Paper text:
Complexes of BAM disulphide bonded to SurA-EspP cross-linked via BamA β1 (S425C) and residue S1299C in the C-terminal β-signal of EspP were purified from the E. coli OM, and the structures solved by cryoEM. The structures revealed BamA- EspP- hybrid barrels captured as late stage folding intermediates, as expected. Fully-folded EspP β-barrels that contain the native α-helix in the barrel’s lumen were present in all structures. In these structures, both Extended and Compact conformations of SurA are present, as well as a structure in which SurA was not observed, consistent with the chaperone dissociating from POTRA-1 in these late-stage folding complexes. Collectively, these results suggest that these late-stage folding intermediates of EspP are no longer being chaperoned by SurA. Hence, we term these as ‘Release Complexes’, in which SurA has returned to a structural ensemble that includes both Extended and Compact states. These Release Complexes also support the functional relevance of our previous POTRA-1:SurA disulphide bonded structures, since the interaction between POTRA-1 and SurA is again observed without SurA being covalently tethered to BAM at this position.
Author numbering:
A (entry chain A): 100 to 496, 504 to 681, 691 to 807
B (entry chain E): 24 to 113
C (entry chain D): 26 to 243
D (entry chain C): 30 to 89, 96 to 107, 109 to 210
């Protein structure tokens, strides 16, 4: 008790080492030594004015329990960091770029002056880089000094240095055993004369030279760089000696960690071929393909040299499996809708077979829905995908009964680029439609000429259509992406023999750009566009109209609550009942238009209370969303007082905070935002919550 | 239906014209290995025969093979040498 | 929580709770008295009971830790064959998902790193102690493991046939021959070898492997 | 039961036997590594769920060499036999058919061991003849046929259990 800043188990190990193992005679003689040893233990952390006391409690059977009372009074604090000897840079400009601090802003609490012996060497390396990168080649440390005040609260640090001089590079004399690659390597080592010498530039140069050599298979070469400094002209030449090793061959590549996904699945996405000359970049391409696949928490590589030969090397991929798609089964019983039924699954990588299978359905008093979908992504070896689905629904409450079937074939072209094409059938039927200007005018455009006096309306259609699509993604992780782009377009076109005739094109894009080197703060830009239009004469059916708001399009509004609002007709047979109105009234409901455009820019920032160790399961963003939707099959001169619903001007806006967590039940998403802009009836649910 | 992209396929030991030029009977296994590197396959049935095959299958435009075979004696001394610049027929 | 009681009754309740079948409080009291008295004569029997308890509850990583500890403290305990057998058994049973066996998909091409280690452990047991109580079961399980590894190897070779990297399939079937020239998988995979040799027109060995296949056709 | 058997999986018993690959004339087979090599041993082992996966009972002079229960250095070794008689009259409340005291040879009757685990009552008779081996007055138990469920089963594992019941109790009190 009393060990605020340390852990009990390490103290237990310390007493274990000192022959004070639990289950031994309590040596009252050694108590002072035990206390003093623990004082020396806190000597390491930095608590020097600490006192430890021992309490001995006898127990039955003549036993003893020990209370170790710890008093960690005050630890060391850095008073000031004092670099001495410099006539180019001010001290503050140098201290600003260390890790240890001597002072922190009064309005901010993000760190302390807790001196650590390890951080000194890193800080000296940092300072050496800071001078030497701007051509202070001769610069070196004279010495370092760490001093303790005889108070055990103040720590003083001094670094004696020598600014040398300001030198600049002259020319490159790279040579050695280039294995017939002098041209590209000399283009890479090239630099115009007169530019000042830079330190880390040479290191990056060497690393990229090694990488380029590796790309042709020289896995383990030796590259060294040596400067020669002319003091007279303030110049420096550099000698780059390279020695390409033997060309390495992959004996075999293995896989670890995949206890549920069959080895074929992992091996299908490999550009480096077992039994061939090693490609230092193809292995990395395979690794990022595995990441992009989307169901591996972490993937890493290790190229172990086999002891039996100087050439054979085994490439080992180690992966950590993650959950992917999960079961559900809900039977909700009540007074309205009675005992409603619902169940289904939605998972890719079915039992590890690599498929993508999703079945779902619900039984309700007035709404029965079912959908089944399967898709094999690598039907052939090359990677064509064969997929299909069926869906059936009937919704009575509005009456709508329909069922549709579709099949798709996809294939890759070049890298990162895939094309899909397929066929679809859909049978649809509507009955007892409520009065609404847009649906009535669409039906007249079809040629039924229905009666607005009463809602006795029946309509039926059978449609055949063709589907096309194009996808391009280069994004580093298949989930929680942190860098790259992801564009997905898809369109459907009717074909002759179909009651409706139209064409619809939808497009989505997500673009991630990282700022910090460690990929922890990210900038996300999301765009989504959509346009559907009748092919000719006819117009695109209302029941395929777009929407907005909701959770996936624009956070802040309820589901599909953005766009033109419908107009009812008040009359006898509506219930717009005869004893409830007389003149045409707009209806607060929302029916989407035929064109939509939305976007959102947001900042991805880590969350606290989760260690970086488990950071990969939580993700917080600050988001700014913009959205709009409108119709083209609209007239305003026909309705002077009724507001226009064809103006691309009512651009709804929102801003707030959002959070995602890959909980052991699925991707749980929470968000709170405010709609800084709104129009008409845009009832907003401030806080949004959903799964997937 | 050859529109689908296909990753480049390689299966060789990367035989280079200079390296096959260095070949001359009368070396031992270590000497020839240092000349060319460890073969990726040898006959496991009855005899010690070293096969250096150099294949390349780019895109949908055919294949390219440089074949080399070496047979030695039971004392590991080079005895017979063979080489085929292309693949018999197709 | 648990009072400091004489080892007598704590071990007595350990035995009778274990005989009952309740295992949570069983391991709890076992670990308690194991921590409390790491000197008593119980220690050997305590740890031999605790390994069985961890195995039965499927706490396999902790079972492996405890079993390594036991092997370390007395490498020549008179009845170590049992603990080695349990090592192999835990290591093998750790390679099951209990859901892909529901649906009947065979896990013969998943990660075969636990199978290899279980094989090594069983082989060590049968080597050292060929006259103990765990011989025939070890032999049967070890045959099963050998066949599973053969199946995995054939799976990888078959995929490389579908892709068309014939050097790799040649090397894989050759490794099959050197390491498992006794299973059905190699007998089925020899045609892949002959196909491979015929592909690069290195047919001179294709007829050799053809005799290899034909000789044991029946 | 989930008490004295391996995990529920049992599909490995029907394992296809290994057919060694013959070598055609004119060529031979490559070298074997031997890392995965199966030896031949004696049979007569319990397999499947039949095998008793239960930790062995270590006695706690504690002879554990099978039936050998000859516990022996105390100079009062004679009185241990009436001290064992205290275990018989009281404790187990068991009795002996021909319990010699001067010869220190007790023929304890067959007991009835039943401690959970769905264990059928076990009838074990021991030869409680007290020797004087390598020490002062020793005591020995030499078991015989043990009935249990079956007429008599004398598996190697169960013999360790049956001797243990007396080994635990006799060391427990005496």
């Amino acid at each position: 008790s009393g060990n605020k800043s340390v852990k009990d188990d390490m103290l237990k190990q310390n007493l274990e080492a000192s022959g004070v193992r639990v289950g031994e005679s309590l040596d009252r003689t050694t108590i002072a030594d035990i206390e003093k040893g623990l004082e020396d233990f806190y000597y390491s952390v930095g608590k020097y004015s600490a006192s430890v006391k021992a309490v001995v409690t006898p127990l039955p059977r003549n036993r003893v329990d020990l209370k170790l009372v710890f008093q960690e009074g005050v630890s060391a604090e850095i008073q000031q960091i004092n670099i001495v000897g410099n006539h180019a840079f001010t001290t503050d400009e140098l201290i600003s770029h260390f890790q240890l601090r001597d002072e922190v802003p009064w309005w901010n609490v993000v760190g302390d002056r807790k001196y650590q012996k390890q951080k000194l060497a890193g800080d000296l390396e940092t300072l050496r880089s800071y001078y030497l990168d701007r051509g202070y080649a001769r610069f070196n440390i004279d010495s370092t000094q760490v001093s303790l005040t005889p108070d055990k609260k103040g720590i003083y640090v001094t670094v004696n240095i020598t600014e040398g001089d300001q030198y600049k590079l002259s020319g490159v004399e790279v040579s050695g055993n280039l294995a017939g690659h002098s041209a590209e390597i000399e283009q890479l080592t090239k630099i115009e004369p007169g530019e000042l010498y830079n330190g880390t530039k040479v290191t990056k140069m060497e690393d990229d030279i090694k990488k380029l050599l590796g790309r042709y298979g020289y896995a383990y070469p030796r590259v060294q760089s040596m400067p020669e400094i002319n003091d007279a002209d303030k110049t420096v030449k550099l000698r780059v000696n390279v020695d390409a090793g033997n060309r390495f061959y992959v004996r075999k590549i293995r896989f670890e960690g995949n206890d549920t996904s069959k080895d074929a699945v992992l091996r299908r996405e490999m550009r480096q071929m077992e039994g061939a000359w090693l490609g230092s970049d193809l292995v990395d391409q395979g690794k990022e393909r595995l990441n992009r696949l989307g169901f591996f928490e972490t993937v890493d590589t290790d190229t172990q040299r086999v002891p039996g030969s100087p050439d054979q090397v085994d490439v080992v991929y180690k992966v950590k499996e993650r959950n992917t798609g999960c079961f559900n089964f809900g039977i909700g019983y009540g007074t309205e809708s009675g005992v409603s039924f619902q169940a289904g699954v939605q998972q890719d990588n079915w039992l590890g077979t690599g498929y993508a299978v999703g079945i779902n359905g619900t039984k309700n008093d007035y709404q029965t829905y079912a959908e089944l979908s399967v898709t094999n992504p690598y039907f052939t070896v090359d990677g064509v995908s064969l997929g299909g689905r069926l869906f059936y629904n009937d919704f009575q409450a509005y009456t709508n009964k329909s069922y549709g079937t579709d099949v798709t074939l996809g294939f890759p072209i070049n890298e990162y680029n895939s094309l899909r094409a397929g066929l679809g059938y859909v049978h649809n039927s509507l009955s007892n439609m409520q009065p609404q200007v847009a649906m009535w005018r669409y039906l007249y455009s079809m040629g039924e000429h229905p009666s607005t006096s009463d809602q006795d309306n029946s309509f039926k259609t059978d449609d055949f259509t063709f589907n096309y699509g194009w996808t391009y993604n280069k994004l580093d992780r298949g989930y929680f992406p942190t860098d790259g782009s992801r564009v997905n377009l898809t369109g459907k076109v009717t074909i002759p023999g179909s009651d409706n005739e139209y064409y619809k094109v939808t497009l989505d894009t997500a673009t991630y750009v990282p700022i910090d080197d460690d990929h922890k703060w990210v900038v996300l830009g999301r765009t989504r566009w959509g346009y559907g239009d009748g092919l000719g004469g006819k117009e695109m059916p209302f029941y395929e109209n777009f929407y907005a708001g909701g959770s996936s399009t624009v956070r802040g509004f309820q589901s599909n609550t953005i766009g033109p609002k419908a107009v009812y007709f008040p009359h006898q047979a509506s219930n717009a009942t005869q004893d409830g109105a007389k003149d045409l009234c707009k209806s607060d409901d929302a029916v989407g238009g035929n064109a939509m455009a939305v976007a959102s820019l947001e900042f991805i920032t880590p969350t606290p209370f989760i260690s970086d160790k488990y950071a990969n399961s939580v993700r917080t963003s600050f988001f700014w969303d913009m959205g709009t939707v409108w119709d083209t099959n609209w007239d305003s001169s026909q309705y002077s007082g009724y507001p226009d619903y064809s103006d691309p001007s009512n651009i709804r806006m929102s801003a707030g905070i959002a959070l995602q967590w890959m909980s052991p039940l699925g991707p749980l998403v929470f968000s709170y935002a405010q709609p800084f802009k709104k129009y008409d009836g845009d009832k907003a649910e401030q806080f949004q919550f959903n799964i997937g | 239906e050859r529109v689908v992209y296909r990753p480049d396929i390689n299966q060789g030991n990367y035989l280079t014209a200079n390296d096959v030029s260095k070949i001359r009977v009368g070396m031992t296994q270590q000497q020839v290995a240092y000349a060319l590197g460890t073969p990726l396959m040898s006959d496991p049935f009855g005899t010690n025969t070293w096969f250096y095959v150099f294949r390349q299958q780019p895109g949908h435009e055919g294949v390219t093979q440089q074949t080399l075979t070496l047979t030695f004696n039971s004392s590991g001394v080079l005895t017979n040498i063979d080489n085929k610049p292309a693949l018999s027929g197709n | 929580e648990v009072p400091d009681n004489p080892p007598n009754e704590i071990y007595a309740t350990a035995q009778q709770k274990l005989q009952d079948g309740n295992w949570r409080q069983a391991i709890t009291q076992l670990e308690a008295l194991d921590n409390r008295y790491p000197f008593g004569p119980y220690s050997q029997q305590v740890q031999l009971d605790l390994i069985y308890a961890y195995y039965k509850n499927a706490d396999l990583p902790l079972a492996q830790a405890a079993i390594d500890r036991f092997i370390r403290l007395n490498p020549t305990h008179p009845n170590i064959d049992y603990v080695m057998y349990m090592r192999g058994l835990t290591n093998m049973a750790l390679d099951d998902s209990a859901l892909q066996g529901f649906f009947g998909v065979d896990r013969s091409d998943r990660d075969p790193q636990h199978a290899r280690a279980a094989f090594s452990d069983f082989s060590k047991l049968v080597r050292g102690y060929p006259n103990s109580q765990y011989t025939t079961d070890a032999t049967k399980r070890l045959v099963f493991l050998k066949d599973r590894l053969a199946k995995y190897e054939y799976s990888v070779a078959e995929y490389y046939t579908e892709r068309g990297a014939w050097v790799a399939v040649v090397n894989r079937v050759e490794g099959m021959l050197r390491d498992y020239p006794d299973t059905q998988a190699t007998r089925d995979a020899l045609p892949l070898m002959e196909n491979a040799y015929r592909q690069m027109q290195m047919n001179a060995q294709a007829e050799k492997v053809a005799k290899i296949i034909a000789a044991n056709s029946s | 039961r989930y008490s004295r058997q391996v995990s529920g999986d049992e599909a490995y018993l029907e394992a296809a036997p290994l057919a060694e690959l013959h070598a055609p004339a004119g060529m031979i087979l490559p070298v074997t590594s031997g890392d995965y090599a199966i030896p031949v041993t004696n049979g007569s082992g319990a397999v499947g769920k039949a095998l008793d996966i239960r930790p062995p009972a270590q006695p706690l002079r504690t002879q554990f060499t099978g039936d050998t229960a000859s516990l022996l250095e105390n100079g009062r070794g004679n009185t241990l036999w009436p001290q064992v008689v205290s275990v018989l009259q009281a404790k187990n409340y068991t009795i002996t058919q021909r319990d010699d005291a001067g010869q220190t040879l007790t023929t304890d009757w067959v007991q009835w061991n039943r401690l959970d685990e769905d264990e059928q009552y076990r009838g074990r008779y021991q030869i409680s003849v007290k020797p004087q081996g390598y020490q002062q007055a020793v005591t020995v138990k030499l078991l015989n046929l043990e009935q249990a469920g079956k007429p008599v089963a004398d598996a190697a594992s169960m013999q360790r259990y049956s001797t243990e019941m007396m080994n635990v109790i006799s060391a427990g009190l005496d």
